[PDB]
Subunit: 134 residues, 6 copies
């Protein structure tokens, strides 16, 4: 059987996105709303635009597929998707939306800095976390 890593073609790995703690990522609702707010025109375009655009299109739709099945169930069902699957798509949606805004290299440097920073005990950790920028 196959083992495909969604981030490998984009220069990262599943293990790398997991270096960021689970409570770092915005909610799925807030990420989808931002993909719309920032990239709706391109996401709906007939042009490919970029591999990030192509991947982001499918991620949005797939979460739609998971939600349409969960909402057709009825509460206990919706909890399973949000608990298990939810973090997976919060990393994926965050990765692609951030890469489109700031660039892939900039996103990866930020990911490591934050992961090291958030892991430093509070007694020693600098007051300002690293920030993302161009």
């Amino acid at each position: 059987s196959m083992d495909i890593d969604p981030y490998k073609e984009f220069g990262a790995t599943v293990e790398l996105l997991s270096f960021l703690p689970s409570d770092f990522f915005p909610s799925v609702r807030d990420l989808l709303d931002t993909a719309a707010a920032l990239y709706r025109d391109a996401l709906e375009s007939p042009e490919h635009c970029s591999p990030h655009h192509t991947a982001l299109r499918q991620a949005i739709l797939c979460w739609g597929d998971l939600m349409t099945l969960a909402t057709w169930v009825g509460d206990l069902v919706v909890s399973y998707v949000n608990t298990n699957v939810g973090l997976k798509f919060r990393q994926l949606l965050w990765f692609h939306i951030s890469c489109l805004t700031f660039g892939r290299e900039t996103v990866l440097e930020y990911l490591v800095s934050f992961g090291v920073w958030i892991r430093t005990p509070p007694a020693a950790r600098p007051p300002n976390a690293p920030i993302l920028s161009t």
Copy 2:
């Protein structure tokens, strides 16, 4: 029926204004007080001034109409306050904020700020920078 977007002639949309959370926008009272404090002479002027001015005039007046109708109900006949706060109040808080800010700072500056804040406030407290984006020229 028609489908008119009040922000479309100004290069924005309802969905775009709604990217800002409900507790971002000032009160209805504080925005009207600011429209007067900043633009009374022009808002009351016989000149058009600008499409923002023309639109801003109608919004203030409309909220006047909405308030008079709801007040004439209570004065001449409580859940109506709940309905207004949920539905109508936010709609006009977004509209008054959009036009007053656009008049002061320019439309491009307002839109860039709207997306930055909408992204910033959506970042969990563990990761978001301490100071939010600011509006300026």
Copy 3:
């Protein structure tokens, strides 16, 4: 009757000063002490100095007149518990009027009318922004 605006000859209006919330203005006492600390020699001078000085003098004097009446009312009102409500009227209603006026004239003399007016609007906009969005540092008055 007439309709006189104390701020009209100074390039502002009552509505404009009220754009600042009541808790923005210092106390009447602290404003009188600052007029004294900064401008006593001129306030007591036989020269006009400036229209702000002429107006500031009368406001100080007028607040004195209002104070003498309240203190005469306190000493001469048999109704004891009612004096608390009578003293409250001055601090609640008339006090704010003179806190705006004394602040306007003292600040205009120090920083200039333009600087005062621009600062007033920036603060009025800033204090009205909900805490989630407004910058931590309010605008400041300076030259």
Copy 4:
């Protein structure tokens, strides 16, 4: 009868020092320790040094006499405030100069009178 202002020969007044609130000034003890720590050799010198030194000498000695008399707490706040202003005024002038001390006094007095909603987070400071 006479009406002598301790600050008048030094270019200020009693009313001016009182423009600073009561909780601005350090304690009397903390000012005396500082007068010693900064100027002990000059205060104890047989040379005049400066009118600020001459005045500061008498204030310290006077405060000692006032302390013996008490050993009323409200009175200690009244006379104590008078000497907290005086000891602070003369020590600060010796360090930073009279003009610098006076501009700081008014800047701070206006600043602390601004309600918390409007006053800048960082107060005015003394500097050389």
Copy 5:
């Protein structure tokens, strides 16, 4: 018996690493995940890379052995002791090598003394922002 200092060939000492308080160092887990996130390609490489890489390889593995042994006590027959005493040893060692690989030996050492002096200053006198790495 011998008296080998793991830090001596790297230009430091045990006494120097212990100048940092116990609550300064991240957890063993957070340090291992960082070694993986930052260097796992090099740690797993057949090339020496550097003496730090060689030492970091052995430390990670040794902590593996210590965990297997303490965990075998619960499964086959304590673990708390391994968390406290040996844990601090490997929290210092893993932090030293990961930090040296990222920032350099001199930078790591200067920071260590500055922080040790800073954290020892009573709160009344010490500056609000601790020293940082660069």
Copy 6:
């Protein structure tokens, strides 16, 4: 009897060190650990190094002698931390800081902090003075 000031040959006084409040100085333990971490090789050297080194050697040793005696109940510990403990916390801090930053820097910082911490909170600047080369 004599009247010896440990700080006099170093250009300071007991009164000046006491201008710093008692809660300014690190613990006795943290100062000894810092002397070791920063200067162990010199403290143990057969060379003089400097008069600061010579004094710091004797102070450390003296605290050892004093500690054995005190550990030889809450009132004895209160007395030691109040009188003798502060004495060596000032001394160990003075010499370690002078070795690191220089005597002038230490003395200027001491007066600045002594005035700063004596300022009431309403007027005192947010950021305290710091030591620096």
